[model samples]
Target: ATLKVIGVGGGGNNAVNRMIVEFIAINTDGQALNLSKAESKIQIGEKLTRGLGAGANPEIGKKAAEESREQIEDAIQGADMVFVTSGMGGGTGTGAAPVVAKIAKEMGALTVGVVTRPFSAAAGVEAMKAAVDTLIVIPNDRLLDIVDKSTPMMEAFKEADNVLRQGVQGISDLIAVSGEVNLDFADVKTIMSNQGSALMGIGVSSGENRAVEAAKKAISSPLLETSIVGAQGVLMNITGGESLSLFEAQEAADIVQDAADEDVNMIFGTVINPELQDEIVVTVIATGF
Candidate 1:
């Protein structure tokens, strides 16, 4: 399946890099877009913004996206799955992502959006829900609680950057890469189609209780909302070394199942990574919360 991960606006323009699928950067500011090294880049609203910017007003971005309608369509065309990443509340990020998502949905791609909410946050929710199949929201302020206050230097704050990239990576890996229990595009579409407000979590664990801890950590990780308690559809994947056992594997799957409602669709798979040795990674995606 073809996956197009498009980074929109200034913050989103900084969100993509080194991956196995197609990467696109869309921005109203020609200057910012110029700095992007994505496989493809689209600069919208040239006449309206003069290759400048939306001036922090979503309306500007709203109009700019309207101006570049055809170009945007060409960039995202033909992808089997679409992942839209952007900084919410920003002019272009808020305005463009939803419009792009709407186009991707109309074009028949499974559209998912992963966005970073500004400190207090500030509109794109309505439009986002209209087009995005699954929305993963990361509130920027919550990240402050997990940072290093001592050293204080950060990706500069790219743990958040890493978080967004990992979400796309997690689901994409489940689809394209082969596993002991292979899951194709249908598996993904079955869970993701129309499953809104997705709660995504990733956890890595080692030592004796690896499987158990990994599952717990993933579901417990901070998101925009609560746990995967009432998720309509759940998709989880476990990756570990050859040492991993079916006993623990089933244990891992059970952890995820216990977290959600009984009358729902829950699917999972085990993927082997020879180099993992003593470590196991659990990645979870739950929606309709």
Candidate 2:
């Protein structure tokens, strides 16, 4: 499946750049998967300003996006799935993000938007939900907690970037890449199609009790401050070594389900990687929370 990740405006551009860095870094470890050539990844913004920024004016950002509509649409063409992410308080991100997401949806792709510090967050949420299949709202303030204070400023930014990029990468791996038990793309679409806002969280642990530990971390991760109590749907992705037990994986799913509404619909899958001999990774994406 073809996955397209588009970053809109200055903040979006920064996030995308970091994502590319992490993406390349992942390949260097092993597998040598050339993600750079497989998917469409690019940033869209005002050419007139030429990186001067939108001056925080939403109207100007909207106009710039309008002027480049054809180019924006061209970038997303023929993609099976598309993620449109941006920082929302300013002009380009606030105004142009929704416009870009709508265009991708118009191309008949499964589109999801991730916005940070949104000015009219509700607008993009409503607009993208109307146009695409899903929308994930992540405030800038919440992301700040992901960075380690003692680290250098740039390193801290990388930490935060890794947090966001990992969540996206996990979902992409679960859907497109093969594993012990595969998660159907249609099922993922179903979870995202729920009629409510969505939240994405990821956690990793190793050794004994790793499954339950990771599940708890996923639910309590700073990225999602609100409780998952009334969530309508939950999807769990478990990645572990060849030695991972089915019982352990199920228990992890049980923990997530217990935290959500009793009647919550849940789907899960497992991936076996020999490289993760003692490690377990749990990625959660929920909606209607």
Candidate 3:
């Protein structure tokens, strides 16, 4: 199943722009559609408030998305999995995002909503959760705790972009590429289909004890404000050197299991990289936060 990512409104568009910039940089020709297939990422906004923004009036943003409903539905056609992202304090993000998510869900796509600066924090999110199958909430206040105080204002969005890119790319790597421990769409679907919000954690470490260290750090990552100990479902991906062992592999899973509530649903993937001689990278996406 193909995965589609859509950025809604100004904040959402900025987030998507960062992802596109990185995608272009990675392609050898440094072009947006340099890949064999057309890119699956898109940006949606109101024509009137498109570039200028919705001026923090959610009603206007909602109307804008409704006006462009045809185009938005066109962009989502054929996608089996859809990820909608927005920063929910202002007009477009707060208003239009849920509408986009609802459209995607109604189309029979597994919808995941990544919301930042959630309006009403909990109440605003419940409405979206009712529409989308999965929700990933990153509180605006929590960003301050995770990000360095010295980081400039503009650069902060870049950090947020990077954080989101990791989880999205991690899932992509599992689905598009073959790994030592295979992970397919079914495995991902099972995890994402679980009830409640999802929490994502990522960690990178080198030298001895890399597997355990990476797993530990991932669960405690600042990006995930909730505790993973009681998560009902966990989808873990471990990438490391070719020397990654069965023992090391089990150790990584073991650490995650030890941290979680007993009898949780856990699925894992391991990708070996010849280039990663001493490094180990772990990504954990879990639900029931």
Candidate 4:
């Protein structure tokens, strides 16, 4: 299977570089199975990590944004789906995340984002600016929801000093994966198909009321399939939070919908946080006319 994953870093260069090392270890751990063979088909887009805030790093995020745009454009060229994961509220992740998604959409691909809240260590006023920029650039409806990494990451680092392992597990565990959604590469492709002109949307919900409402609107709205051709895709997301609110649930639904103009198989919900709010943060990927 062909997959495109982009990891945008925020906070500090130290944190971002650590993330890079950890990713290298996971994908290239000398397994006889040789998953490395898949590396050729899987290209990870990387941008320089710049500290969040003004003072000395104000221009950092701006530079990162330009680099991220280049990488995302590369990722979206002839690609199926693009997944953006970032520890937002900073220069790199916050500044780069939205632009990356925008680039993917401009490239005629579907896009959505999984953004994490900041840790206490880096929760400065700059962090809030990052949050604002992120929300504005990518509509709240286009996010797959938000995750708080404050306590968990700090606890792990303070504990065994195995900060890397613990951080990975915590982030991975927090990811909400719903078996029901059946999101995959093909699903993403289908959503991208809708980008033939406009954009698409996905609505995920257990009950028929709100979910039905969103889906019906998607089906009826000519704006839904203006850019896409047919439905043939799925999205895979690592989620956190135990139970998602009705609105947040709808965001996941949009992930599949905005991927392409087609029908999704199922929405798999993996609960990570037990205290999540009830807002559906949609993940949307689109392209230019």
Candidate 5:
């Protein structure tokens, strides 16, 4: 199961690049594949990002979507499965993610999109709408699920600026995390050609049960992850593997982070703990990559 992983970031690069590790902080995908180690990281194959120009965010999204489709297809070639994680905000994630997913699915690979929605802020709301519109274009049957980015992320950023704030602030950060998260398709592979599996994660203030409830309600379909509200402090990890590539690992980890950020739960640390406990966990064991 030799897999290739690609790390993608949207923003100009500086703001969203480093945060990739924060989402890939835990070895959720590693646990699923039984590959646990300090080195339990994904091999970064390539980076495809969209930078903001003098134009509007929508312009960025359009350009990124067109280019991302080609790049993603090239990355997933010959792999058993290709997982994509992007934070939907600003220009890149919202416009490019859906196109990339479409390309992956068309290439005969199962496409899993771990996306983040924008906050309730003016800019965030705009990004969220674009992301949702992109989802509608995708064959609802082939997508695993679209993760929601919490609207309250602005309030949650007060804690750790390391990853939590990064996750909420940019679509590029989420794409960067896609560089190293993986999930075992055997235990939880998408029903190829079915888009209903697309999961959504919405961020909220930590301890905000009301936000959590709203998130749950807003998400009527099957979701890959859930929100952790009032996220004052917390840690989350997603582990799964097969021939899964490092990029796939990053995709899953980023999605988990999106959920955490939207939940407003802060993760102080992320690592592969053989004894998984007290954290949001997703265990996927699959023979098929």
Candidate 6:
């Protein structure tokens, strides 16, 4: 799969840089783009913003993306799957991501948006609602449920970024690496293609009851906005050492199924990593909410 990750605006750019994947970082501000360590960077709307950024105005952000439409198109073309990432509530990402997705969509790539909601923030409807095929939203306010009030500001953002990375990486890994029970790209399309909103949760456990514990943790993620009970589609990938059993793998599915709709489209995949012992990782993506 020719997968590409494009981070738009400042917040999104940082997330992509951390992922260390095939990526392109775009911004309206040249200095900001230069500030990013991303090897591939594009500064959009030279005349409109003059690399000054969108002045925190999403309207200008939208125009800036329009001005650089062809450039974004050139970057997204020939990709099988594209991940458009951003942090909402600001100008560039809020306004520009939809335009970026517009081009990605026209080019026939399965575009999924991995975006974050501000700590106390409409994040724009068109950007998530109409543009992308599937949207995975990470709410910053929810982080409060996990992080201590005494946590530092910089570390709080890092935690949020880490959660976002795991979710995106989980989806990418499910397709890129073949598992004992294959969760093909086609299966991903089936669940995501019917998407309205999506939630991703990852859980890891190394206890005596690790299998059940991991699934429970994923289902009750502090970062997700709500329960996965109403989701129309669910895809889960379980990772563990060679000792992972067939029944142990399905144990996760049973736990997740109890929380979802009776008729939800449920899919599961398992990967065994010989390097680990007594640890189980469950990555879950629930869609069509």
Backbone collision count in every prediction? 0, 0, 0, 63, 49, 0
Q: Which lDDT values do the candidates have, in the order given?
A: 0.61, 0.52, 0.53, 0.32, 0.30, 0.61
lDDT of 6 by residue, 1-289 (tens): 5667787877677666566525788887677786787777887777897635237776776788899998888877788667676654466666777788778867977666654543212445334546765554444333222112111111222222343346532332211110111122232343333433345565666768989987787766443324366666777777777888988898987998878779877877786766446677776666655
Worst 10 residues of 5 by lDDT: 171-180
RMSD of each: 10.7, 12.0, 12.0, 17.4, 18.0, 10.4
Ten residues in sequence with the least summed lDDT for candidate 4: 21-30
Clashing pairs in 2: none
Q: Write the per-residue lDDT of candidate 2 for residues 12-93, one digit (tens) a residue.
A: 5555545541110101011212223324443334364564622665455555666667876776667766666654343345
Error of 6 at 46 (Å): 1.5
TM-score ranking, high to low: 6, 1, 2, 3, 5, 4
What is the clash tally of candidate 3?
Answer: 0
Tens digits of lDDT, candidate 4, 108-189: 4433343344232122223322222121112222232211222222121122122113442221111121111223323233
**Residue lDDT tens for model 1, 1-289:** 5667787787667665422157889887777876788979988788888745247766776677778988988988888767676653466667877888888878887676655553322256546655665554444433221111101111112222333346632332121110111222232343342433244565667897889987787666434114466567776778777888998899999988887779868868786767566777776766554
Measured with C-alpha atoms, the lDDT of residue 178 in candidate 1 is: 7
Candidates 1 and 6, the one with greater TM-score = 6
The lDDT, on a scale of 0 to 1, for candidate 6 is 0.61
**Residue pairs in collision within model 1:** none
lDDT of 4 at 232: 33
Off by over 4 Å in 4: 1-3, 10-59, 118-289
Model 1 TM-score, 2 decimals: 0.60
